[PDB]
């Protein structure tokens, strides 16, 4: 079976990511995490979106060892907080490309890379 | 000079739209509107982003009669909330494609459709 993941970010990029992954053979998106309270417990792309307080319980419930980060329009300060929060939970974190690479069209949303120091600091 | 608009949605979709437009000769995005208070009064590409409370004052200040929706990740319930909020400010409301039509590149972000009268009026 495909590797189960959470996608952190249920904005345009994250939803598009879930759609692509569902079709693919590598990852199965089980749910989204999103900081936007208005999306809490709403359904998009056929799965549930949750506030970040649900991170640990979902990781343990579903035995998730990988979270995909799709928050291209978040500030650097916010992205750092997110990555740090995930690091404490002992999951691998992969990220879609930076916003400029997305909007200028030189990298696909689906091009995932492991996060690095460069990603944390900015 | 191009028709002045606001773009509702300051995420990756709205940013791409603003480039579509700004390079173009039809609309000029004056500012973004975004529900995310964290983004209020931040700037992207020389355009500043405002919370929706600023809608009335921006429309009046810039004589805006058209608002473009770039919120493909909004639930239909939430999108209708947004559309009705704009209807009552006497602007025309256009929208980029739905998410699923953007992902496979079937439709371009630059294709702007008038929202339904049903959605506009909350029928
Ligand atoms: Cl969006």
B13–A75 C-beta distance less than 8 A:
no
Question: B73 CA distance to ligand 1 centroid (A)?
Answer: 4
A102–B73 C-beta distance less than 8 A:
no
Distance of alpha carbon A21 from alpha carbon A116, whole angstroms: 22
Pairing relationship of beta strands B43-44 and B47-50 according to DSSP bridges: antiparallel
User: In the CATH hierarchy, which top-level class contains the domain A1-122?
Assistant: alpha beta
Match domain B1-123 to its CATH number in 3.30.70.260, 3.50.50.60, 3.40.50.720, 3.30.465.10. 3.40.50.720
Question: B39 CA distance to ligand 1 centroid (A)?
Answer: 14
Distance of alpha carbon B59 from alpha carbon B29, whole angstroms: 12
Closest CA to B32 of B3, B71, B1: B71
CA distance B92 to chain A (A): 23
Question: In this structure, how many other beta carbons lie within 10 angstroms of the beta carbon of residue A56?
Answer: 13
Method: X-ray
Three-class DSSP category at A1: coil
Closest CA to B11 of A103, A7, A116, A27: A103
Contact A119, A93 (CB under 8 A): no
- In Å, what is the CA distance from B123 to each residue of A21, B117, B120? 36, 8, 8
Three-class DSSP category at A54: helix
């Amino acid at each position: 079976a495909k590797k189960k993941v959470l996608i952190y970010g249920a904005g345009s990029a994250g939803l598009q990511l879930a759609n692509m992954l569902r079709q693919g053979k590598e990852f199965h998106p089980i749910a989204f995490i999103d900081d936007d309270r208005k999306k809490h417990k709403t359904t998009m792309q056929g799965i549930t979106i949750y506030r970040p307080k649900y991170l640990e319980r979902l990781i343990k419930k579903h035995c998730i060892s990988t979270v995909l980060l799709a928050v291209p329009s978040a500030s650097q300060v916010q992205k750092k907080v997110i990555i740090e929060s995930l690091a404490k939970l002992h999951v691998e974190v992969l990220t879609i490309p930076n916003l400029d690479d997305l909007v200028n069209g030189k990298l696909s949303i689906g091009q995932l890379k492991e996060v690095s120091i460069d990603d944390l600091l900015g």
